[PDB]
């Protein structure tokens, strides 16, 4: 094949799957004295592997990863409040850039 | 469809519950007697005829 | 463009020049206007019970004690 | 930038007057007789029925006789 | 409300890969990429991420968050964004 | 507060110690107070008001 | 001696005059029109003053032959239900001169000849005695409507929005007048005084009540029929659409109180449940198809039909109190529907969308505005302390104790209606600023701000202290609501 | 004078809206406030007046619906119950526009803020004022508009207004049990006012004719009235709109969903006392209901990790048990739990805004963790507040909740027994998720980040006065209001609160106590306690995360999406009312079936009849 599209694929879903599993761990993590451990564990799982060369042995893997990952979600995950879905998202917003008001309409002659 | 599933069985511990209180019967465990009024039951100051 | 919309219970962060004389005014406003209010309250507030305690009310008001019976209505 | 219309966005249009004009679509199909049959001419007389036996059972109750109507 | 400008935001940026023990802290610059010239393991890219995000607060959208691969984008992104 | 690195942690205001320390410790006080007077009155022994 | 002879003449000179005004002189037009409009006004109020709220007949009479033997005659008249609505429709008037004053040059002097037209026209129709005549001028308002509607039309669709509005009219006019017709040959005259007291035969008042029915339930938007309203009133221009649910939509449900209820004592009993079943069931489904409705003026023209549906519930629910709250509803629906037309129609002469997709968060901009649709939208959304609750508090009322089942039905229309209305106020006002659409756009000025105050303060004072609406017309109702029978 | 109870929070709301430019973003704040504290002065007046001075006021101002024999009428009744009311009102909504203040500052629209406030004042003193069911109607509905007004102050917010939209929509199904009952008690009574019906309502005893079947009068009538009660208490039938009514600003939080509007519905039982008594039927539901919503909120409540959303159910747990101290014709713990609810938890409610506000504006207990140390004022204050949540023994609640819970194990009807059983375990969720909160902030390792930490700002001083005044009534007042309230037999009530002979269990819920259940909630609550403290600061290893396979997700989703209200409700009713809205009116009655007759029905049937007709 000789071509790198199919795997920075697979080198951008492990970065994102990453990311989301140390995510909720945090949220299920509510302590952090668990949350090292936690997030150890975590990154040894993604380390059991870490040799897959064959492309028929990373569809299966990557299914049943997203799959395990969707079974917990923690029903309420952290959003910063300003982000958009948090707590003040468009809290007081910055006016619109280019917006004008005429004065003198209604007039006549 | 799968969270009616759920609702059916949150309600169904209220009433469940409910009537478990039923299987008891704690009206006739009273530990005294119905309270008693003088002049039939305060009969002239809760209506009636004087 | 906030200037330009008139705003008028007050613009976002409207902070007049002379809003303590302003607020002066408006309190005296409230208060002269609150008289016919009190004024013509005194015409009212019918209470046929008499306190056990003397309440300070009785020097504005005498619909107290006198509408006791409920034959002439 | 000096108008005070709107910019009559053209996937808008076509929105806006599509739904005044539906008699084209609404015309003979399978879902249309259930749904008329069900909510125009079921539905009324249900009610109808519910209003006509509400003054029976009022009459009833005072006992004079239940008009015709 | 300061909106701390770049005079203190190149140490804090680059304290978080200096924290990091897998990269030596001797040869870390400003400009600078962990995937050949700090030699860092392509799990932990994400990591980083998380770590500045728990010092600054803004979550970049997952889209370009990956896309970050050099110290440098890092440190012109927090400081591009209003909020952090 | 002194700063440390990270947490440059300000002190409470002088009102905002002394003032709580000084209504808990009523609280605290008022706890056993209505624990001695009208504490007997439910515990299940010496029923007060001609008891 | 303000009597209703003048009252009907001062418009017609306004017109007359008018007529014979050069198109130049745009200054005198306007000018004389709105000075002849608020004499009107005046005259009507007047009366008012001079009502004598004692007596069961008729007040200031004025009678003119017709017919060479006397048979029917033009005879005038008010007695305790059309003074309010005298005086409403010469208010709406001089609001809906006001409303089109800036853009008078197009319009021309055609455009108030139409209006004073329609003027005395509805002014001839509320004080109209003699049965015939008032179907003369019944459909009389016909002619205005449709010019208005079809020469100062918004958009180029209005051509197919007339047809109906007209023909749908025409037919229910004719099946009216074939009824007119047996009453004349049977009875002999058309006087309402007398008509009222002549005994009628079962079999023949059942047809004669379909007869009028047939008609008056297209004025009032019934559910077989009232598809003409929204299609014929999205497309009108604002001061003339501001009257098709200002005075134009209270002709059948009015003339029901009038022409209906005292005439034909034997047939509303008998066809009281069928009256219910149709409102019951159009304050839900008109209500329920308003949800889904993305134009700006449709969904007021919907609320307008499902408040007229829950009236005529009220209306056919003989009581003492049903009927003066139907009239109560009636008014403050005139006030209210008038004034959310002006909102929605002030919003289109600056921007021209008519789409709810494109409004959007005018709470930023143009507050004074959003003030006022905010008070107009709480009228609508039926809150106590404004004039309305007052007019459906008695219409559930007079319901409830009459059948059980038709008031809660009924008030599952006052419930639904905080489902659209709210949820437009939401979306238009109160949204987030979009600036790629209305990129630029003023507030009220002095015209459209001195046009509201008007109905703000009638709808404070008819909330507030509805008494003397009550106090004016108790008499009317009783004698409406005791007829034939005697116990 | 009585007049000026009512009319100056109108006036100054009245005139600050409409002179905001010419009063700044603060002269609104000291001329409103003012206004509401010589209002509440008034109160207190009144108070002293009429409570101790025990003679009632009585007025009327004009006609409202001056038609045949249904006579509204402006006049109010300034009655002993009346009056308490007055107090807890008018002292809470002064103190939160002292806490507004502070707050409020840097937020722009200043002067909308006490216009609304003061609005909301206005309209529930002439609630609480009123003397007839459609003059306090129009108290009932204005408390929803204000609702609507408040939690729509941010009009950008686009969460903000989906919950305001859906907030009037579920008041308004709730409250129209309520509109419905109005007209109710008229076709038995001809009479709307309050005097002429409490003098003979037990006099009726025929039936009805309803939509199916012919049923009771009174007790239809008192269904009814629950019914509207419901939609303003967030009870088991309409309570979607209390969890996420906490979308806008804190202050007026304090105000409208933890202490005033909290007392609309237990306010509606509370005030038409001698018509629920002669409806048994009404109360065995009416207990029913609030005993399960207030167990469902105190299950509800534990899992949320949000400062505001745990604690509007612990607001929904105690309208359940108020409703159901309503429901047992035991109404005096009904109210003296709602004027220590009024303090106890508009306390707490102040000190959850006073440290979201200091702390960057962050409401979580995920992500913040411990800050006690850095200033110990509103700690204190919340740990007051918390302990009479709890009712700690001799405390302001200990006071209420005990002899609540004691009627509730009195009554031996089949609504007794099992309610007290659900109130009995509802205070150990109570107590679990009281001291969740407790520790999961301010007694853990700081979670959060470093910079809001370095921008720490204790509570300014004009905002902590409020707090002060909340700490020191709600230590004292339950102590004061025990003897003199609930003493057996008090005699400031007079007609106000009238109890029937028959269902009277008063003496002997104190007299007959077995001493082994009086004093068993004290160890529900100091087990919860312990079940916290272990798990949320020790036994966290495996206590806190379930990584099971199957079942305990799921257990994890059925309480965080409380028990898919949100969902089904949704679904099953709006999105089909929405989408047959289109489908079936739209398509099969109006447009599209009946259109047959207008355009495009009968123009193209007269383009061939009349063409075929010329040759
Ligand atoms: C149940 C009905 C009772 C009668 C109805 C009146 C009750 C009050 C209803 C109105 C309350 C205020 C709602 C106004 C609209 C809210 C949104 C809005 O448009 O705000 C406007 C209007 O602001 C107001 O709220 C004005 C309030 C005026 C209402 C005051 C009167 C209320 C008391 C009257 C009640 C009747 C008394 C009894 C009469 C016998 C401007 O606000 P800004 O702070 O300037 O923000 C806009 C952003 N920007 C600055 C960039 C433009
Ligand atoms: C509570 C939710 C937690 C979720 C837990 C469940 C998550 C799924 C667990 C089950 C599935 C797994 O093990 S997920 C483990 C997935 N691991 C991989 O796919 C290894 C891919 N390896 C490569 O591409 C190359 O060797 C190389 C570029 C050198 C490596 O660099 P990167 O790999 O960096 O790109």
Redesign the pocket.
């Known amino acids: 094949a000789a071509y790198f599209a199919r795997?920075a694929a697979?080198?951008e879903r492990?970065?994102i799957?990453y990311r989301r599993?140390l995510k909720?761990?945090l949220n299920?993590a509510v302590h952090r004295h668990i949350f090292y451990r936690d997030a150890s564990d975590?990154r040894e799982?993604?380390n059991?592997?870490?040799?897959?060369e064959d492309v028929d042995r990373?569809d299966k893997?990557?299914a049943?990863?997203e799959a395990?990952?969707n079974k917990?979600r923690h029903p309420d995950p952290y959003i910063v409040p300003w982000a958009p879905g948090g707590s003040k998202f468009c809290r007081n917003p910055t006016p619109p850039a280019g917006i004008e008001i005429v004065y003198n309409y209604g007039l006549e002659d | 469809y799968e969270a009616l599933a759920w609702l059916s069985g949150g309600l169904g511990f209220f009433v469940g519950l409910g009537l478990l209180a039923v299987l008891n019967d704690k009206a006739s465990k009273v530990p005294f007697t119905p309270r008693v009024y003088p002049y039939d039951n305060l009969r002239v100051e809760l209506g009636g005829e004087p | 463009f906030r200037a330009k919309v008139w705003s008028m219970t007050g613009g976002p962060n409207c902070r007049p020049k002379h809003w303590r004389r302003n607020t002066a005014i408006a309190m005296f406003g409230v208060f002269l206007v609150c008289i016919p209010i009190a004024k013509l309250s005194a015409k009212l507030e019918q209470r046929p019970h008499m306190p056990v305690r003397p309440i300070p009310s009785q020097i504005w008001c005498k619909n107290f004690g006198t509408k006791d019976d409920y034959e002439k209505e | 930038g000096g108008g005070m219309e709107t910019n009559k966005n053209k996937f808008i249009e076509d929105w806006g007057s599509a739904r005044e004009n539906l008699e084209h679509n609404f015309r003979w199909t399978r879902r249309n007789f259930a749904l008329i049959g069900i909510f125009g001419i079921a539905l009324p007389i249900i009610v109808y029925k519910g209003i006509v036996k509400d003054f029976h059972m009022q009459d009833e109750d005072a006992g004079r006789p239940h008009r015709k109507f | 409300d300061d909106h701390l400008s770049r005079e203190a935001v190149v140490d804090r940026v680059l304290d978080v890969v200096k924290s990091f023990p897998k990269v030596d802290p001797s040869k870390v610059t400003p400009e600078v990429h962990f995937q050949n010239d700090l030699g860092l393991?392509?799990?932990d890219?994400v990591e980083i991420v998380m770590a500045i995000e728990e010092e600054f607060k803004l979550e970049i959208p997952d889209k370009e968050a990956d896309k970050i691969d050099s110290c440098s984008l890092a440190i012109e992104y927090v400081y591009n964004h209003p909020m952090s | 507060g002194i700063t440390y690195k990270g947490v440059t942690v300000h002190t409470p205001k002088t009102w905002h110690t002394v003032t709580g320390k000084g209504l808990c410790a009523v609280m605290w006080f008022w706890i056993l107070y209505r624990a001695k007077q009208d504490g007997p009155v439910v515990m299940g022994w010496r029923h007060p008001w001609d008891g | 001696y303000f009597n209703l002879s003048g009252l009907i003449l001062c418009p017609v000179l306004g017109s007359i005059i008018l007529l014979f005004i050069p198109n130049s002189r745009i200054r005198l037009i306007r000018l004389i029109g709105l000075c002849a409009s608020l004499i009107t006004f005046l005259y009507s109020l007047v009366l008012w003053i001079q009502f004598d709220s004692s007596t069961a007949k008729f007040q200031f009479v004025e009678s003119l032959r017709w017919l060479p033997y006397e048979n029917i005659n033009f005879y005038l008249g008010i007695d305790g239900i059309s003074l309010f609505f005298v005086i409403l429709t010469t208010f709406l008037i001089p609001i809906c001169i006001l409303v089109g004053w800036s853009g008078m040059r197009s319009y021309g002097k055609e455009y108030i000849i139409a209006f004073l037209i329609c003027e005395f026209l509805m002014i001839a129709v509320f004080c109209m005695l003699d049965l015939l005549l008032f179907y003369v001028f019944f459909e009389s308002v016909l002619i205005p409507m449709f010019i208005i509607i079809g020469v100062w039309g918004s958009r180029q669709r209005k051509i197919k929005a007339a047809y109906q509005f007209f023909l749908y009219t025409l037919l229910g006019s004719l099946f009216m007048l074939l009824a007119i017709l047996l009453i004349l040959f049977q009875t002999g005259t058309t006087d309402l005084q007398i008509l009222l007291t002549t005994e009628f035969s079962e079999r023949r008042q059942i047809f004669l009540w379909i007869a009028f029915f047939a008609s008056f339930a297209v004025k009032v938007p019934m559910v077989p029929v009232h598809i003409w309203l929204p299609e014929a009133h999205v497309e009108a221009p604002t001061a003339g659409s501001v009257i098709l649910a200002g005075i134009l939509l209270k002709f059948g449900t009015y003339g029901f109180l009038r022409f209906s209820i005292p005439m034909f004592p034997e047939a509303t009993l008998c066809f009281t449940p069928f009256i219910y079943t149709l409102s019951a069931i159009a304050i839900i489904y008109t209500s329920l198809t308003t949800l889904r409705q993305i134009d700006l003026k449709k969904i007021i023209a919907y609320s307008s039909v499902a408040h007229m549906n829950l009236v005529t519930i009220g209306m056919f629910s003989l009581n003492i109190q049903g009927i003066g709250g139907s009239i109560l509803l009636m008014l403050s629906h005139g006030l209210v529907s008038s004034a959310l037309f002006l909102c929605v129609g002030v919003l289109y002469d600056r921007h021209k969308t008519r789409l709810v997709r494109y409004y959007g968060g005018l709470v930023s901009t143009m507050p004074n505005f959003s003030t006022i649709f905010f008070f107009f939208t709480l009228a609508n959304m039926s809150l106590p302390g404004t004039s309305s609750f007052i007019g459906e508090f008695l219409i559930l009322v007079g319901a409830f104790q009459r059948n059980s089942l038709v008031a809660t039905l009924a008030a599952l229309g006052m419930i639904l209606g905080a489902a659209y209305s709210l949820w437009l106020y939401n979306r238009v006002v109160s949204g987030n600023l979009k600036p790629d659409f209305l990129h630029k756009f003023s507030d009220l000025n002095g015209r459209e701000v001195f046009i509201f105050i008007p109905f703000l303060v009638g709808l404070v004072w008819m909330g507030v202290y509805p008494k003397v609406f009550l106090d004016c017309m108790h008499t009317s109702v009783s004698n409406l609501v005791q007829h034939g029978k005697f116990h | 004078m009585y007049l000026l109870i009512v009319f100056l929070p109108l006036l100054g709301s009245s005139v600050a809206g409409f002179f905001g430019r010419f009063l700044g973003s603060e002269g609104s704040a000291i001329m409103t406030t003012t206004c509401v504290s010589f209002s509440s002065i008034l109160s207190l007046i009144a108070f002293y007046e009429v409570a101790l001075g025990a003679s009632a006021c009585y007025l009327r101002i004009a006609p409202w619906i001056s038609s045949e024999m249904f006579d509204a009428s402006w006049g109010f009744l300034f009655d002993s119950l009346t009056v308490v009311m007055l107090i807890v009102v008018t002292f809470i909504s002064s103190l939160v526009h002292l806490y507004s203040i502070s707050y409020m500052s840097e937020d722009p629209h200043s002067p909308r803020f006490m216009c609304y406030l003061s609005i909301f004042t206005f309209f529930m003193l002439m609630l609480v004022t009123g003397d007839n069911f459609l003059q306090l109607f129009l108290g009932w509905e204005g408390v929803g508009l204000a609702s609507y007004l408040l939690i729509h102050f941010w009009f950008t917010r686009l969460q903000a207004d989906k919950a305001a939209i859906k907030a009037m929509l579920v008041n308004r199904v709730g409250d129209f049990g309520l509109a419905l009952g109005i007209l109710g008690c008229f076709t038995l009574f001809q009479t709307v006012d309050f005097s002429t019906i409490f003098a003979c309502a037990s006099v009726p005893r025929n039936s009805w004719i309803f939509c199916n079947m012919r049923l009771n009068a009174i007790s239809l009538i008192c269904i009814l009235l629950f019914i509207g009660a419901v939609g303003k208490s967030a009870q088991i039938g309409l309570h979607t709109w209390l969890p996420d009514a906490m979308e806008g600003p804190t202050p007026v939080s304090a105000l409208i969903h933890a202490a005033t509007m909290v007392t609309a519905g237990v306010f509606m039982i509370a005030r038409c006392s001698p018509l629920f008594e002669y409806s048994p039927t009404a109360l065995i539901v009416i207990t029913f209901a609030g005993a399960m919503t207030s167990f469902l909120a105190a299950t509800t409540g534990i899992l949320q990790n949000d400062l505001k959303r745990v604690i509007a159910y612990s607001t929904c747990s105690q309208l359940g048990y108020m409703i159901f101290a309503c429901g047992i014709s035991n109404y005096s713990v009904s109210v003296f739990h709602l004027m220590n609810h009024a303090f106890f938890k508009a306390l707490l409610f102040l000190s959850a805004g006073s440290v979201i506000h200091a702390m960057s504006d962050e409401q979580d207990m995920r992500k913040m963790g411990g800050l006690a140390s850095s200033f110990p004022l509103t700690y204190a204050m919340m740990l007051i507040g918390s302990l009479s949540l709890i009712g700690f023994p001799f405390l302001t609640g200990f006071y209420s909740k005990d002899v609540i819970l004691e009627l509730a194990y009195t009554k031996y009807t089949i609504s007794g027994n099992f309610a007290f059983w659900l109130g009995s375990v509802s205070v150990l969720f109570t107590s679990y998720y009281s001291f969740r909160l407790l520790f999961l902030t301010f007694l853990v390792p700081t979670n959060s980040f470093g910079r809001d930490i370095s921008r720490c700002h204790d509570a300014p001083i004009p905002m902590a006065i409020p707090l002060i005044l909340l700490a020191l009534g709600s230590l004292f007042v339950g102590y004061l209001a025990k003897d003199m309230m609930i003493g057996l037999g008090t005699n400031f009530w007079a007609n106000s609160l009238l109890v029937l002979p028959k269902n009277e269990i008063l003496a002997e819920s104190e007299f007959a106590a077995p001493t082994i259940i009086k004093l068993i909630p004290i160890l529900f609550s100091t087990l919860g306690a312990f079940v916290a403290y272990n798990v949320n600061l020790v036994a966290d290893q495996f206590q806190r995360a379930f990584?099971t396979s199957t079942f305990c997700n799921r257990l994890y989703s059925f309480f965080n999406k409380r028990w898919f209200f949100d969902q089904v409700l949704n679904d099953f009713l709006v999105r089909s009312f929405l989408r047959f809205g289109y489908e079936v009116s739209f398509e099969a009655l109006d447009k599209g079936a009946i259109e047959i007759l207008g355009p495009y029905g009968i123009s193209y049937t007269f383009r061939r009849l009349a063409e075929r007709i010329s040759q």
């Open positions: 795997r697979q080198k492990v970065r799957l599993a909720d761990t299920w975590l799982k993604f059991v592997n870490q040799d897959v990373i893997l990557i049943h990863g395990e990952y917990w | 393991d392509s799990l890219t | 990584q």
